Amino acid sequence: WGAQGHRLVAEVADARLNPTARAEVDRLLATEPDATLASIAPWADQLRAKDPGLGRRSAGWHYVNIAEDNCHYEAPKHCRNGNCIVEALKAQSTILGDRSLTDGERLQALKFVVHLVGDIHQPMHAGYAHDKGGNDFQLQFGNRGTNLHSLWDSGMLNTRKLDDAGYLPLLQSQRAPKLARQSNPQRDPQTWAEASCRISMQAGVYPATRKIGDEYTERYRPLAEAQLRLAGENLAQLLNRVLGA
Ligand SMILES: Nc1nc2c(ncn2[C@@H]2O[C@H](COP(=O)(O)O)[C@@H](O)[C@H]2O)c(=O)[nH]1
Ligand SMILES: [Zn+2]
Ligand SMILES: [Zn+2]
Ligand SMILES: [Zn+2]
Protein backbone atom coordinates (compact mmCIF):
# COMPACT_ATOMS: atom_id res chain seq x y z
CA TRP A 1 0.00 0.00 0.00
CA GLY A 2 0.81 3.73 -0.19
CA ALA A 3 1.26 5.67 3.08
CA GLN A 4 -2.55 6.08 3.70
CA GLY A 5 -3.27 2.31 3.29
CA HIS A 6 -0.50 1.55 5.86
CA ARG A 7 -1.87 4.13 8.39
CA LEU A 8 -5.49 2.77 7.94
CA VAL A 9 -4.27 -0.81 8.66
CA ALA A 10 -2.57 0.46 11.91
CA GLU A 11 -5.64 2.59 12.91
CA VAL A 12 -8.04 -0.41 12.44
CA ALA A 13 -5.58 -2.57 14.51
CA ASP A 14 -4.96 0.02 17.27
CA ALA A 15 -8.71 0.05 18.18
CA ARG A 16 -8.66 -3.83 18.56
CA LEU A 17 -5.60 -4.15 20.88
CA ASN A 18 -6.29 -5.87 24.28
CA PRO A 19 -5.20 -3.83 27.36
CA THR A 20 -1.94 -5.88 27.76
CA ALA A 21 -0.87 -5.44 24.06
CA ARG A 22 -1.97 -1.74 24.14
CA ALA A 23 0.27 -1.08 27.23
CA GLU A 24 3.32 -2.80 25.61
CA VAL A 25 2.79 -1.11 22.17
CA ASP A 26 2.54 2.33 23.91
CA ARG A 27 5.78 1.53 25.92
CA LEU A 28 7.67 0.76 22.66
CA LEU A 29 6.18 3.86 20.88
CA ALA A 30 7.18 6.04 23.91
CA THR A 31 10.94 5.39 23.14
CA GLU A 32 10.37 7.56 20.03
CA PRO A 33 8.64 10.84 20.96
CA ASP A 34 5.26 11.46 19.13
CA ALA A 35 5.33 8.03 17.37
CA THR A 36 1.87 6.36 16.93
CA LEU A 37 0.99 2.96 15.41
CA ALA A 38 -0.27 4.98 12.37
CA SER A 39 2.84 7.27 12.07
CA ILE A 40 5.29 4.27 12.07
CA ALA A 41 3.10 2.28 9.56
CA PRO A 42 4.78 3.75 6.38
CA TRP A 43 8.32 3.86 7.93
CA ALA A 44 9.74 0.73 6.17
CA ASP A 45 8.99 2.37 2.72
CA GLN A 46 10.92 5.58 3.77
CA LEU A 47 13.73 3.27 5.08
CA ARG A 48 13.76 1.51 1.64
CA ALA A 49 13.91 4.91 -0.20
CA LYS A 50 16.53 6.69 2.05
CA ASP A 51 18.90 4.07 3.70
CA PRO A 52 21.41 2.56 1.18
CA GLY A 53 22.29 -0.14 3.81
CA LEU A 54 19.28 -1.79 5.64
CA GLY A 55 16.81 0.00 3.26
CA ARG A 56 18.40 -1.76 0.23
CA ARG A 57 18.75 -5.11 2.16
CA SER A 58 15.06 -4.94 3.30
CA ALA A 59 13.52 -4.04 -0.16
CA GLY A 60 12.72 -7.73 -0.88
CA TRP A 61 10.91 -7.99 2.53
CA HIS A 62 7.84 -6.05 1.11
CA TYR A 63 6.71 -8.80 -1.32
CA VAL A 64 6.91 -12.41 -2.51
CA ASN A 65 6.45 -13.64 -6.13
CA ILE A 66 4.36 -16.86 -6.02
CA ALA A 67 1.72 -16.39 -8.84
CA GLU A 68 3.86 -18.37 -11.40
CA ASP A 69 3.69 -21.32 -8.85
CA ASN A 70 -0.16 -20.96 -8.58
CA CYS A 71 0.15 -19.22 -5.13
CA HIS A 72 1.97 -22.21 -3.49
CA TYR A 73 4.82 -20.75 -1.38
CA GLU A 74 8.04 -22.84 -0.88
CA ALA A 75 10.78 -20.91 1.07
CA PRO A 76 13.84 -22.29 -0.80
CA LYS A 77 12.23 -21.20 -4.17
CA HIS A 78 10.81 -17.69 -3.54
CA CYS A 79 12.98 -16.60 -0.57
CA ARG A 80 16.42 -18.37 -0.42
CA ASN A 81 18.18 -16.16 2.19
CA GLY A 82 14.88 -15.13 3.86
CA ASN A 83 14.58 -11.84 1.85
CA CYS A 84 10.78 -11.97 1.27
CA ILE A 85 7.68 -10.81 3.17
CA VAL A 86 6.74 -14.34 4.50
CA GLU A 87 10.15 -14.99 6.17
CA ALA A 88 10.70 -11.33 7.17
CA LEU A 89 7.25 -11.05 8.92
CA LYS A 90 7.91 -14.36 10.78
CA ALA A 91 11.38 -13.16 11.95
CA GLN A 92 10.21 -9.64 12.94
CA SER A 93 7.20 -11.14 14.88
CA THR A 94 9.66 -13.39 16.82
CA ILE A 95 11.97 -10.37 17.50
CA LEU A 96 8.94 -8.24 18.62
CA GLY A 97 7.90 -10.94 21.16
CA ASP A 98 11.48 -11.32 22.59
CA ARG A 99 11.19 -9.67 26.09
CA SER A 100 15.04 -10.04 26.52
CA LEU A 101 15.56 -7.27 23.85
CA THR A 102 15.60 -3.46 24.41
CA ASP A 103 12.48 -1.31 23.81
CA GLY A 104 14.41 0.30 20.85
CA GLU A 105 15.10 -3.11 19.19
CA ARG A 106 11.44 -4.20 19.80
CA LEU A 107 10.08 -0.86 18.40
CA GLN A 108 12.08 -1.49 15.18
CA ALA A 109 10.49 -4.96 14.88
CA LEU A 110 7.02 -3.33 15.57
CA LYS A 111 7.60 -0.88 12.66
CA PHE A 112 8.39 -3.84 10.30
CA VAL A 113 5.45 -5.97 11.65
CA VAL A 114 2.92 -3.07 11.24
CA HIS A 115 4.11 -2.38 7.64
CA LEU A 116 4.44 -6.04 6.49
CA VAL A 117 1.01 -7.21 7.78
CA GLY A 118 -0.27 -4.27 5.60
CA ASP A 119 1.80 -5.22 2.51
CA ILE A 120 1.17 -9.04 2.81
CA HIS A 121 -2.60 -8.21 2.37
CA GLN A 122 -2.01 -6.14 -0.87
CA PRO A 123 -2.73 -8.73 -3.64
CA MET A 124 0.00 -7.37 -6.00
CA HIS A 125 2.60 -7.87 -3.17
CA ALA A 126 2.15 -11.70 -3.68
CA GLY A 127 1.76 -11.69 -7.52
CA TYR A 128 4.04 -12.39 -10.56
CA ALA A 129 7.84 -12.16 -10.70
CA HIS A 130 7.32 -11.66 -14.49
CA ASP A 131 5.93 -8.07 -14.27
CA LYS A 132 7.35 -7.44 -10.70
CA GLY A 133 4.01 -7.47 -8.80
CA GLY A 134 2.27 -5.45 -11.59
CA ASN A 135 4.86 -2.61 -11.74
CA ASP A 136 5.62 -3.52 -15.41
CA PHE A 137 1.85 -3.83 -16.22
CA GLN A 138 1.32 -0.18 -17.37
CA LEU A 139 -2.28 1.06 -17.97
CA GLN A 140 -4.48 4.18 -18.37
CA PHE A 141 -6.72 4.86 -15.31
CA GLY A 142 -9.14 7.68 -16.21
CA ASN A 143 -7.15 10.26 -18.27
CA ARG A 144 -3.85 9.41 -16.44
CA GLY A 145 -1.05 6.79 -16.82
CA THR A 146 -0.21 4.32 -14.01
CA ASN A 147 0.62 0.61 -13.43
CA LEU A 148 -1.34 -2.29 -11.87
CA HIS A 149 0.90 -2.21 -8.72
CA SER A 150 0.34 1.57 -8.08
CA LEU A 151 -3.39 1.12 -8.87
CA TRP A 152 -3.76 -1.32 -5.89
CA ASP A 153 -1.19 0.50 -3.63
CA SER A 154 -3.00 3.89 -3.80
CA GLY A 155 -4.77 4.57 -7.18
CA MET A 156 -8.19 3.06 -6.20
CA LEU A 157 -8.01 4.17 -2.54
CA ASN A 158 -7.24 7.77 -3.74
CA THR A 159 -10.55 7.85 -5.73
CA ARG A 160 -12.43 8.24 -2.34
CA LYS A 161 -10.56 11.64 -1.77
CA LEU A 162 -10.71 10.98 2.03
CA ASP A 163 -8.13 11.61 4.73
CA ASP A 164 -7.75 8.86 7.40
CA ALA A 165 -10.54 10.51 9.51
CA GLY A 166 -13.02 9.96 6.60
CA TYR A 167 -11.60 6.62 5.38
CA LEU A 168 -11.24 4.82 8.77
CA PRO A 169 -14.99 4.78 9.76
CA LEU A 170 -15.77 3.58 6.18
CA LEU A 171 -13.46 0.51 6.74
CA GLN A 172 -14.92 0.03 10.29
CA SER A 173 -18.52 0.08 8.88
CA GLN A 174 -17.81 -3.06 6.72
CA ARG A 175 -19.21 -6.47 7.77
CA ALA A 176 -16.54 -8.08 10.02
CA PRO A 177 -14.39 -10.54 7.98
CA LYS A 178 -14.03 -14.21 9.17
CA LEU A 179 -10.55 -14.33 10.88
CA ALA A 180 -8.65 -17.50 11.89
CA ARG A 181 -9.77 -18.38 15.48
CA GLN A 182 -6.10 -17.94 16.57
CA SER A 183 -2.91 -16.10 15.51
CA ASN A 184 0.09 -18.34 14.70
CA PRO A 185 2.92 -15.87 14.00
CA GLN A 186 5.12 -18.57 12.30
CA ARG A 187 2.41 -20.02 9.91
CA ASP A 188 -0.07 -17.15 9.16
CA PRO A 189 2.36 -15.15 6.92
CA GLN A 190 2.43 -17.98 4.29
CA THR A 191 -1.44 -18.34 4.54
CA TRP A 192 -1.88 -14.54 4.09
CA ALA A 193 0.62 -14.30 1.16
CA GLU A 194 -1.18 -17.26 -0.58
CA ALA A 195 -4.65 -15.67 -0.05
CA SER A 196 -3.35 -12.30 -1.44
CA CYS A 197 -1.80 -14.18 -4.47
CA ARG A 198 -5.16 -15.92 -5.19
CA ILE A 199 -6.74 -12.38 -5.45
CA SER A 200 -3.94 -11.27 -7.90
CA MET A 201 -4.94 -14.36 -10.02
CA GLN A 202 -8.80 -13.71 -9.89
CA ALA A 203 -10.74 -13.09 -13.16
CA GLY A 204 -10.44 -9.39 -14.17
CA VAL A 205 -7.82 -8.21 -11.56
CA TYR A 206 -5.46 -8.20 -14.55
CA PRO A 207 -7.71 -6.33 -17.02
CA ALA A 208 -8.24 -7.47 -20.67
CA THR A 209 -8.00 -3.77 -21.81
CA ARG A 210 -5.17 -1.17 -21.42
CA LYS A 211 -7.72 1.61 -20.57
CA ILE A 212 -9.79 1.23 -17.33
CA GLY A 213 -11.85 3.62 -15.13
CA ASP A 214 -15.05 3.58 -13.01
CA GLU A 215 -16.09 -0.04 -13.84
CA TYR A 216 -12.70 -1.42 -12.58
CA THR A 217 -12.87 0.88 -9.47
CA GLU A 218 -16.50 -0.17 -8.82
CA ARG A 219 -15.53 -3.89 -8.98
CA TYR A 220 -12.08 -3.85 -7.25
CA ARG A 221 -11.97 -0.83 -4.85
CA PRO A 222 -14.32 -2.73 -2.45
CA LEU A 223 -11.80 -5.66 -2.59
CA ALA A 224 -8.88 -3.30 -1.84
CA GLU A 225 -10.99 -1.84 1.04
CA ALA A 226 -11.94 -5.33 2.38
CA GLN A 227 -8.18 -6.21 2.33
CA LEU A 228 -7.30 -3.05 4.41
CA ARG A 229 -9.98 -4.03 7.06
CA LEU A 230 -8.72 -7.69 7.02
CA ALA A 231 -5.05 -6.51 7.36
CA GLY A 232 -6.04 -4.28 10.35
CA GLU A 233 -7.92 -7.15 12.11
CA ASN A 234 -5.08 -9.65 11.38
CA LEU A 235 -2.50 -7.08 12.69
CA ALA A 236 -4.47 -6.59 15.96
CA GLN A 237 -4.85 -10.39 16.45
CA LEU A 238 -1.04 -10.81 15.86
CA LEU A 239 -0.07 -7.97 18.27
CA ASN A 240 -2.61 -9.38 20.82
CA ARG A 241 -0.94 -12.89 20.59
CA VAL A 242 2.73 -11.60 20.48
CA LEU A 243 2.43 -8.76 23.11
CA GLY A 244 -0.83 -9.63 25.00
CA ALA A 245 0.23 -11.98 27.90
N1 LIG B 1 5.19 -8.55 -5.89
C1 LIG B 1 6.24 -7.77 -6.22
N2 LIG B 1 6.27 -6.49 -5.82
C2 LIG B 1 7.37 -5.86 -6.23
C3 LIG B 1 8.43 -6.35 -7.02
N3 LIG B 1 9.43 -5.39 -7.14
C4 LIG B 1 8.99 -4.37 -6.41
N4 LIG B 1 7.74 -4.60 -5.85
C5 LIG B 1 6.85 -3.70 -5.11
O1 LIG B 1 6.35 -2.74 -6.03
C6 LIG B 1 6.30 -1.43 -5.42
C7 LIG B 1 7.17 -0.49 -6.21
O2 LIG B 1 8.46 -1.11 -6.33
P1 LIG B 1 9.84 -0.17 -6.30
O3 LIG B 1 9.76 0.63 -7.60
O4 LIG B 1 9.82 0.60 -5.01
O5 LIG B 1 11.01 -1.20 -6.36
C8 LIG B 1 6.67 -1.63 -3.94
O6 LIG B 1 5.49 -1.69 -3.14
C9 LIG B 1 7.50 -2.93 -3.96
O7 LIG B 1 7.37 -3.71 -2.78
C10 LIG B 1 8.38 -7.70 -7.43
O8 LIG B 1 9.26 -8.32 -8.02
N5 LIG B 1 7.23 -8.35 -6.98
ZN1 LIG C 1 2.67 -0.77 1.12
ZN1 LIG D 1 3.31 -1.84 -3.14
ZN1 LIG E 1 6.10 -1.71 1.71
Numbering used by the authors: 27 to 271
Per the authors:
We have performed structural analyses of SmNuc1 nuclease from Stenotrophomonas maltophilia, including RNA cleavage product binding and mutagenesis in a newly discovered flexible Arg74‐motif, involved in substrate binding and product release and likely contributing to the high catalytic rate. The activity of SmNuc1 towards c‐di‐GMP in crystal resulted in a distinguished complex with the emerging product 5′‐GMP.
Purine nucleotide binding differs compared to pyrimidines, confirming the plasticity of the active site. The enzyme–product interactions indicate a gradual, stepwise product release.
